[PDB]
């Protein structure tokens, strides 16, 4: 619901529901990502990626980001109250928030011991993506993933945190702002309750500064839009109203 006086029953069910929605919309399960860390690209395979053209790497990365976004839209549609919002407000929250959630989820695929990331079956450093010529942007994404990875999120924590990244009533363009404030309030209450119950409140002060995630996503989507205008990826749109806002 979106109602006031949210009981302990509603709060604890909000936690379990959001956590269920999170794991059922993850392309890769956490145990498979952790188990694949020892599977690292050799020097000849990394050279194979570096000798691919700008457009071949752009096509690979863009198609995987398209899937990551589609999974996040499924996650958002499972959050209680979200599908009851207008199509305008759903699209306003997803346009800003969807890629911000993808950027947070990336910390699961980041290994801080050797600074590598999961990409197409194995782990590799940022040198793997040299043909794209986005070493400054990609270095920022590696840094943000490193800082989040040092928090050691549980599955409940990263699920609630990404739910609050989406359910934000301060996105410009919301026509039912009050209603999104009520959903955000209850998710904050469940997040703070869960952190307090599990003695994990110390992560609150370590969360990325408010504005850092929006700024990084802004630089990231700007670059993707520039790449899409020079070499358009053909997408079979799963959510055509949202697609229309980002592509046409
Ligand atoms: C692959 C990966 C990166 C590096 N990526 C460089 C290329 N890129 C660009 O956006 C480029 C920069 C502008 C042009 C494209 C992003 C995909 C980030 C960082 C990270 F923290 C996790 C992952 N693994 S992951 O498993 O989380 C994952 C794999 C593939 C995905 F698509 C999404 C996540
Ligand atoms: O074994 C312990 O040491 C222990 C101590 C406290 C809590 C605890 N219960 N709690 C409730 O809201 C609550 C209450 Cl008051 C009645 C029935 C059931 C609950 C439940 F946890 F299920 F919500 C909390 C809220 C915030 C922070 C907390 F730490 C708790 C706990 F679950 C275990
Ligand atoms: O209906 C669909 O299936 C669908 C799939 C992905 C998006 C999507 N793409 N996207 C990109 O930045 C992106 C990606 Cl991931 C790859 C190549 C080109 C782009 C471009 F930059 F052009 F939008 C987004 C950024 C924020 C919020 C989004 F919802 C998206 C979309 F809007 C709809």
Swiss-Prot record:
Top-level taxon of origin: Eukaryota
Disulfide bonds: none
Highest classification ranks of the organism: Eukaryota, Metazoa, Chordata, Craniata, Vertebrata
Family per record: Belongs to the nuclear hormone receptor family. NR1 subfamily.
Alphabetized UniProt keyword annotations: Activator, Biological rhythms, Developmental protein, Disease variant, DNA-binding, Metal-binding, Nucleus, Receptor, Transcription, Transcription regulation, Zinc, Zinc-finger
Disease: Immunodeficiency 42: An autosomal recessive primary immunodeficiency characterized by increased susceptibility to concomitant candidiasis and mycobacteriosis. Candidiasis is characterized by persistent and/or recurrent infections of the skin, nails and mucous membranes caused by organisms of the genus Candida. Mycobacteriosis is characterized by infections caused by moderately virulent mycobacterial species, such as Bacillus Calmette-Guerin (BCG) vaccine, environmental non-tuberculous mycobacteria, and by the more virulent Mycobacterium tuberculosis.
Induction: Up-regulated in the state of obesity.
GO MF annotation list: DNA-binding transcription factor activity; DNA-binding transcription factor activity, RNA polymerase II-specific; DNA-binding transcription repressor activity, RNA polymerase II-specific; ligand-modulated transcription factor activity; nuclear receptor activity; oxysterol binding; RNA polymerase II cis-regulatory region sequence-specific DNA binding; sequence-specific double-stranded DNA binding
Tissue occurrence: Isoform 1 is widely expressed in many tissues, including liver and adipose, and highly expressed in skeletal muscle. Isoform 2 is primarily expressed in immature thymocytes.
Motif (AF-2): 242-247
Self-association state and partner proteins as the record states: Interacts (via AF-2 motif) with the coactivator NCOA2 (via LXXLL motif). Interacts with the corepressor NCOR1. Interacts with CRY1. Interacts (via AF-2 motif) with the coactivators NCOA1 and PPARGC1A (via LXXLL motif). Interacts (via AF-2 motif) with PROX1. Interacts with FOXP3. Interacts with NR0B2.
Protein name: Nuclear receptor ROR-gamma
GO cellular component terms attached to this protein's record: chromatin; nuclear body; nucleoplasm; nucleus
Annotated domain remarks: The AF-2 (activation function-2) motif is required for recruiting coregulators containing LXXLL motifs such as NCOA1 and NCOA2.
Record domain NR LBD: where: 10-248
Protein localization: Nucleus
A GO biological process held by the record: Peyer's patch development
Role summary: Nuclear receptor that binds DNA as a monomer to ROR response elements (RORE) containing a single core motif half-site 5'-AGGTCA-3' preceded by a short A-T-rich sequence. Key regulator of cellular differentiation, immunity, peripheral circadian rhythm as well as lipid, steroid, xenobiotics and glucose metabolism. Considered to have intrinsic transcriptional activity, have some natural ligands like oxysterols that act as agonists (25-hydroxycholesterol) or inverse agonists (7-oxygenated sterols), enhancing or repressing the transcriptional activity, respectively.
Gene: RORC
């Amino acid at each position: 619901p979106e109602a006031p006086y949210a009981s302990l029953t509603e709060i604890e069910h909000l936690v379990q529901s959001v956590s269920k929605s999170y794991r059922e919309t993850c392309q890769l399960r956490l145990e498979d990502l952790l188990r694949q860390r020892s599977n690292i690209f050799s020097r000849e395979e990394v050279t194979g990626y570096q000798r691919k053209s700008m457009w071949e790497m752009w096509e690979r990365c863009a198609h995987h980001l398209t899937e990551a976004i589609q999974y996040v839209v499924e996650f958002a549609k499972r959050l209680s109250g979200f599908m009851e919002l207008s199509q305008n407000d759903q699209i306003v929250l997803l346009k800003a928030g969807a890629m911000e959630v993808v950027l947070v989820r990336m910390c699961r695929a980041y290994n801080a011991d050797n600074r590598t990331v999961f990409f197409e079956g194995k782990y590799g450093g940022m040198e793997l993506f040299r043909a794209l010529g986005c070493s400054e942007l990609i270095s920022s994404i590696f840094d943000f993933s490193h800082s989040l990875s040092a928090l050691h999120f549980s599955e409940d924590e990263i699920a609630l945190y990404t739910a609050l990244v989406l359910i934000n009533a301060h996105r410009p363009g919301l026509q039912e702002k009050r209603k999104v404030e009520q959903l955000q309030y209850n998710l904050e209450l469940a997040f703070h309750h869960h952190l307090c119950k599990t003695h994990r409140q110390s992560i609150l002060a370590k969360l990325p500064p408010k504005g850092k995630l929006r700024s990084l996503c802004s630089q990231h989507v700007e670059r993707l839009q520039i790449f899409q205008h020079l070499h358009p990826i053909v997408v079979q749109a799963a959510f055509p109203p949202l697609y229309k806002e980002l592509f046409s």
